[PDB]
Amino acid sequence: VQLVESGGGLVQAGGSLRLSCAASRRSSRSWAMHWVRQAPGKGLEWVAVISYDGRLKYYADSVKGRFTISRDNAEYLVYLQMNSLRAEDTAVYYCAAEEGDGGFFDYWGQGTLVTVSSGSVLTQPPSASGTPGQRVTISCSGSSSNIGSNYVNWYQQLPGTAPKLLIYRNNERPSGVPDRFSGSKSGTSASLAISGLRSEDEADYYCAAWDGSLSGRGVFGTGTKLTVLENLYFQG
Ligand SMILES: CN(Cc1cnc2nc(N)nc(N)c2n1)c1ccc(C(=O)N[C@@H](CCC(=O)O)C(=O)O)cc1
Protein backbone atom coordinates (compact mmCIF):
# COMPACT_ATOMS: atom_id res chain seq x y z
CA VAL A 1 0.00 0.00 0.00
CA GLN A 2 1.64 3.20 -1.25
CA LEU A 3 0.17 6.69 -1.49
CA VAL A 4 1.47 8.75 -4.42
CA GLU A 5 1.07 12.53 -4.61
CA SER A 6 1.45 14.43 -7.87
CA GLY A 7 0.94 17.92 -9.27
CA GLY A 8 3.78 19.75 -7.54
CA GLY A 9 6.06 22.22 -9.24
CA LEU A 10 6.74 25.91 -9.68
CA VAL A 11 3.71 28.22 -9.64
CA GLN A 12 3.21 31.98 -9.78
CA ALA A 13 1.79 33.79 -6.76
CA GLY A 14 -1.96 34.31 -6.95
CA GLY A 15 -2.38 31.19 -9.08
CA SER A 16 -4.31 27.98 -8.49
CA LEU A 17 -2.68 24.55 -8.27
CA ARG A 18 -4.45 21.20 -7.93
CA LEU A 19 -2.63 18.35 -6.18
CA SER A 20 -3.72 14.72 -6.41
CA CYS A 21 -3.22 11.72 -4.12
CA ALA A 22 -3.54 8.22 -5.56
CA ALA A 23 -3.25 4.77 -3.98
CA SER A 24 -1.44 1.66 -5.19
CA ARG A 25 -4.25 -0.55 -3.85
CA ARG A 26 -7.90 -0.25 -2.86
CA SER A 27 -9.15 -0.90 0.66
CA SER A 28 -12.40 -2.29 2.05
CA ARG A 29 -12.25 0.08 5.04
CA SER A 30 -13.25 3.75 5.10
CA TRP A 31 -10.41 6.28 5.32
CA ALA A 32 -10.48 9.95 6.14
CA MET A 33 -7.81 11.58 3.98
CA HIS A 34 -5.56 14.43 5.10
CA TRP A 35 -3.03 16.83 3.64
CA VAL A 36 0.05 17.73 5.69
CA ARG A 37 2.73 20.16 4.54
CA GLN A 38 6.30 20.95 5.57
CA ALA A 39 8.14 24.06 4.45
CA PRO A 40 11.83 23.34 3.71
CA GLY A 41 13.63 22.90 7.02
CA LYS A 42 10.48 23.55 9.08
CA GLY A 43 8.03 21.43 11.03
CA LEU A 44 4.94 19.58 9.89
CA GLU A 45 1.72 21.57 9.55
CA TRP A 46 -1.65 19.89 9.21
CA VAL A 47 -3.66 21.42 6.36
CA ALA A 48 -7.00 19.72 5.73
CA VAL A 49 -9.14 16.61 6.15
CA ILE A 50 -12.06 15.15 4.21
CA SER A 51 -14.38 12.49 5.61
CA TYR A 52 -14.74 9.11 3.92
CA ASP A 53 -17.87 10.20 2.02
CA GLY A 54 -16.87 13.84 1.44
CA ARG A 55 -19.61 15.09 3.78
CA LEU A 56 -17.30 16.77 6.33
CA LYS A 57 -14.20 18.91 5.80
CA TYR A 58 -11.94 20.88 8.13
CA TYR A 59 -9.10 23.26 7.33
CA ALA A 60 -6.20 24.92 9.10
CA ASP A 61 -6.72 28.62 9.74
CA SER A 62 -3.71 29.44 7.54
CA VAL A 63 -5.41 28.00 4.42
CA LYS A 64 -9.12 28.47 5.20
CA GLY A 65 -10.99 30.19 2.38
CA ARG A 66 -8.18 29.44 -0.10
CA PHE A 67 -7.74 25.64 -0.16
CA THR A 68 -10.42 23.09 -1.06
CA ILE A 69 -10.10 19.37 -0.37
CA SER A 70 -12.23 16.87 -2.29
CA ARG A 71 -12.25 13.20 -3.21
CA ASP A 72 -13.45 10.92 -6.02
CA ASN A 73 -14.02 7.49 -4.47
CA ALA A 74 -14.86 5.94 -7.85
CA GLU A 75 -11.50 7.00 -9.29
CA TYR A 76 -9.86 6.59 -5.84
CA LEU A 77 -8.28 10.06 -5.84
CA VAL A 78 -8.04 12.84 -3.26
CA TYR A 79 -7.50 16.42 -4.42
CA LEU A 80 -6.13 19.58 -2.82
CA GLN A 81 -7.15 22.65 -4.82
CA MET A 82 -4.83 25.47 -3.70
CA ASN A 83 -6.16 28.89 -4.73
CA SER A 84 -4.69 32.36 -4.17
CA LEU A 85 -1.24 30.89 -3.63
CA ARG A 86 1.21 32.85 -1.48
CA ALA A 87 4.96 32.58 -0.99
CA GLU A 88 4.26 31.13 2.47
CA ASP A 89 2.58 28.10 0.86
CA THR A 90 5.93 26.85 -0.49
CA ALA A 91 6.31 23.39 1.06
CA VAL A 92 6.37 19.66 0.48
CA TYR A 93 2.77 18.43 0.55
CA TYR A 94 1.99 14.96 1.93
CA CYS A 95 -1.31 13.12 1.70
CA ALA A 96 -1.96 10.96 4.76
CA ALA A 97 -4.64 8.40 5.58
CA GLU A 98 -6.59 7.92 8.82
CA GLU A 99 -8.83 4.90 9.28
CA GLY A 100 -12.25 6.02 10.48
CA ASP A 101 -11.91 8.20 13.57
CA GLY A 102 -8.76 6.62 15.03
CA GLY A 103 -6.79 9.87 15.11
CA PHE A 104 -3.46 8.59 13.74
CA PHE A 105 -2.01 8.57 10.22
CA ASP A 106 -1.07 5.02 9.24
CA TYR A 107 0.00 5.78 5.66
CA TRP A 108 1.96 8.67 4.15
CA GLY A 109 2.88 9.48 0.59
CA GLN A 110 6.38 10.55 -0.37
CA GLY A 111 5.24 14.15 -0.80
CA THR A 112 5.25 16.59 -3.70
CA LEU A 113 7.09 19.91 -3.59
CA VAL A 114 5.20 23.13 -4.31
CA THR A 115 7.23 26.30 -4.90
CA VAL A 116 5.35 29.60 -5.07
CA SER A 117 7.46 32.32 -6.68
CA SER A 118 6.99 35.95 -5.60
CA GLY A 119 9.62 37.57 -7.85
CA SER A 120 -2.99 26.50 19.75
CA VAL A 121 0.51 25.00 19.75
CA LEU A 122 1.90 21.71 21.05
CA THR A 123 5.26 22.77 22.49
CA GLN A 124 8.31 20.49 22.18
CA PRO A 125 11.96 21.05 23.08
CA PRO A 126 13.75 22.03 19.85
CA SER A 127 16.78 19.80 20.52
CA ALA A 128 17.49 16.58 22.39
CA SER A 129 20.64 14.47 22.47
CA GLY A 130 22.22 11.46 24.14
CA THR A 131 24.89 8.84 23.74
CA PRO A 132 24.32 5.28 22.50
CA GLY A 133 22.61 3.13 25.11
CA GLN A 134 21.15 6.08 27.02
CA ARG A 135 17.48 6.90 27.59
CA VAL A 136 16.14 10.17 26.17
CA THR A 137 12.77 11.77 26.89
CA ILE A 138 10.92 14.26 24.67
CA SER A 139 8.03 16.26 26.10
CA CYS A 140 4.99 17.71 24.36
CA SER A 141 2.84 20.19 26.29
CA GLY A 142 -0.57 21.39 25.10
CA SER A 143 -3.89 22.55 26.52
CA SER A 144 -7.09 20.98 27.83
CA SER A 145 -8.72 21.25 24.40
CA ASN A 146 -6.02 19.33 22.51
CA ILE A 147 -3.83 16.93 24.51
CA GLY A 148 -6.14 17.11 27.53
CA SER A 149 -9.01 15.87 25.35
CA ASN A 150 -7.49 13.50 22.77
CA TYR A 151 -5.11 10.64 22.19
CA VAL A 152 -1.54 11.76 21.51
CA ASN A 153 0.43 10.30 18.61
CA TRP A 154 4.12 10.46 17.74
CA TYR A 155 5.75 10.51 14.31
CA GLN A 156 9.40 9.94 13.41
CA GLN A 157 10.94 11.59 10.34
CA LEU A 158 14.36 10.31 9.32
CA PRO A 159 16.41 12.74 7.19
CA GLY A 160 15.05 12.95 3.66
CA THR A 161 12.04 10.68 4.27
CA ALA A 162 8.31 10.96 4.87
CA PRO A 163 7.03 10.90 8.47
CA LYS A 164 6.17 7.49 9.90
CA LEU A 165 3.81 6.56 12.71
CA LEU A 166 5.81 5.67 15.83
CA ILE A 167 3.38 5.85 18.77
CA TYR A 168 -0.42 5.97 18.54
CA ARG A 169 -3.14 6.19 21.20
CA ASN A 170 -0.72 7.52 23.85
CA ASN A 171 1.35 4.34 24.18
CA GLU A 172 0.67 1.77 21.43
CA ARG A 173 3.35 0.71 18.95
CA PRO A 174 2.80 -0.32 15.32
CA SER A 175 4.24 -3.57 14.05
CA GLY A 176 7.93 -2.95 13.44
CA VAL A 177 8.43 -0.30 16.15
CA PRO A 178 10.68 -1.84 18.84
CA ASP A 179 9.82 -1.75 22.53
CA ARG A 180 12.65 0.75 23.02
CA PHE A 181 10.08 3.41 22.10
CA SER A 182 7.42 4.10 24.72
CA GLY A 183 4.85 6.86 25.07
CA SER A 184 2.92 8.32 27.99
CA LYS A 185 0.29 10.99 28.58
CA SER A 186 -0.78 12.80 31.75
CA GLY A 187 -3.17 15.73 31.81
CA THR A 188 -2.20 18.34 29.22
CA SER A 189 1.25 16.87 28.46
CA ALA A 190 2.69 13.80 26.79
CA SER A 191 6.20 12.38 26.50
CA LEU A 192 8.09 10.02 24.21
CA ALA A 193 10.77 7.85 25.84
CA ILE A 194 13.55 6.28 23.76
CA SER A 195 15.64 3.73 25.66
CA GLY A 196 18.76 2.05 24.33
CA LEU A 197 19.49 4.96 22.00
CA ARG A 198 20.96 3.90 18.65
CA SER A 199 22.44 5.71 15.67
CA GLU A 200 19.31 4.86 13.66
CA ASP A 201 17.18 6.90 16.09
CA GLU A 202 18.69 10.20 14.88
CA ALA A 203 15.66 11.94 13.36
CA ASP A 204 13.00 14.57 13.92
CA TYR A 205 10.15 13.64 16.26
CA TYR A 206 6.68 15.21 16.23
CA CYS A 207 3.82 14.84 18.67
CA ALA A 208 0.32 15.22 17.25
CA ALA A 209 -3.23 15.58 18.54
CA TRP A 210 -6.45 17.36 17.59
CA ASP A 211 -8.06 20.69 18.41
CA GLY A 212 -11.25 22.68 17.98
CA SER A 213 -14.65 22.56 19.63
CA LEU A 214 -15.08 18.97 18.40
CA SER A 215 -11.36 18.21 17.89
CA GLY A 216 -11.88 18.31 14.13
CA ARG A 217 -8.56 19.92 13.22
CA GLY A 218 -5.19 18.21 13.39
CA VAL A 219 -2.25 19.84 15.13
CA PHE A 220 1.41 18.80 15.06
CA GLY A 221 3.92 19.68 17.74
CA THR A 222 6.74 22.09 17.02
CA GLY A 223 9.19 19.21 16.52
CA THR A 224 12.31 17.89 18.24
CA LYS A 225 15.61 17.13 16.51
CA LEU A 226 17.23 14.13 18.20
CA THR A 227 21.01 13.85 17.84
CA VAL A 228 22.74 10.58 18.76
CA LEU A 229 26.18 11.77 19.83
CA GLU A 230 29.28 9.96 18.57
CA ASN A 231 30.66 10.04 22.10
CA LEU A 232 30.88 8.03 25.30
CA TYR A 233 29.27 8.99 28.61
CA PHE A 234 31.92 7.68 30.98
CA GLN A 235 33.86 10.14 33.11
CA GLY A 236 37.17 9.03 31.60
C1 LIG B 1 -5.48 4.28 3.06
N1 LIG B 1 -5.62 3.58 1.78
C2 LIG B 1 -5.41 4.33 0.55
C3 LIG B 1 -6.64 5.09 0.11
C4 LIG B 1 -7.87 4.92 0.73
N2 LIG B 1 -8.98 5.63 0.31
C5 LIG B 1 -8.86 6.53 -0.74
N3 LIG B 1 -9.95 7.24 -1.17
C6 LIG B 1 -9.83 8.14 -2.21
N4 LIG B 1 -10.89 8.83 -2.62
N5 LIG B 1 -8.61 8.32 -2.83
C7 LIG B 1 -7.50 7.61 -2.41
N6 LIG B 1 -6.29 8.02 -2.77
C8 LIG B 1 -7.63 6.71 -1.36
N7 LIG B 1 -6.53 5.99 -0.93
C9 LIG B 1 -5.47 2.17 1.83
C10 LIG B 1 -5.25 1.60 3.07
C11 LIG B 1 -5.09 0.23 3.20
C12 LIG B 1 -5.16 -0.58 2.07
C13 LIG B 1 -4.97 -2.05 2.26
O1 LIG B 1 -4.29 -2.50 3.41
N8 LIG B 1 -5.46 -2.92 1.38
C14 LIG B 1 -5.16 -4.33 1.52
C15 LIG B 1 -6.39 -5.11 1.94
C16 LIG B 1 -6.81 -4.79 3.37
C17 LIG B 1 -7.75 -3.61 3.36
O2 LIG B 1 -8.73 -3.60 2.59
O3 LIG B 1 -7.57 -2.64 4.12
C18 LIG B 1 -4.63 -4.90 0.23
O4 LIG B 1 -3.92 -5.93 0.25
O5 LIG B 1 -4.91 -4.37 -0.86
C19 LIG B 1 -5.26 0.00 0.81
C20 LIG B 1 -5.53 1.36 0.69
Numbering used by the authors: 2 to 120, 143 to 259
Sentences from the study reporting this entry:
Comparison of the scFv with the original VHH-MTX scaffold, upon which the conditional scFv is based, revealed that the MTX binding pocket is largely maintained, conserving the key interactions of MTX with CDRH1 and FW3 without being perturbed by the diversification of CDRH3 and addition of the light chain. While not directly engaged in the binding of MTX, CDRH2 makes contributions to the stability of the MTX binding pocket formed by the framework and CDRH1. In particular, the carbonyl groups of S52 and Y53 orient the side chains of FW3 residues R72 and N74 to form hydrogen bonds with the pterin moiety of MTX. Mutation of select amino acids of the VHH framework back to the parental M2J1 sequence successfully restore the VH:VL interface with sidechain positions essentially superimposable between structures. As expected, binding of MTX to the scFv resulted in a conformational change of the paratope: in the absence of MTX, W32 is oriented outwards and faces the light chain, while upon MTX binding it rotates inwards to make contact with MTX within the IgV core creating additional space for significant movement of CDRH3 as demonstrated by a 7.1 Å (C-α to C-α) shift of D102. The resulting single chain antibody fragment (scFv; M2J1-MTX) successfully bound MTX albeit with reduced affinity compared to the parental VHH-MTX.
In summary, we generated conditional antibodies whose binding affinity to a target antigen is modulated by a small molecule. In this specific case, we selected MTX, an FDA-approved drug, and CD33, a well-studied and validated antigen for AML therapies, to highlight the application of the conditional antibody technology to CAR T cells. In order to determine if the molecular mechanism of MTX binding in the VHH was maintained after pairing it with an antibody light-chain variable domain, we determined the structures of a conditional scFv in the absence and presence of MTX using anti-CD33 scFv P02_D09, a highly MTX-sensitive scFv. We demonstrated how these antibodies can be used to generate conditional CAR T cells with target-specific cytotoxicity whose activity can be reversibly attenuated by the addition of a small molecule to potentially mitigate therapy-associated toxicities.
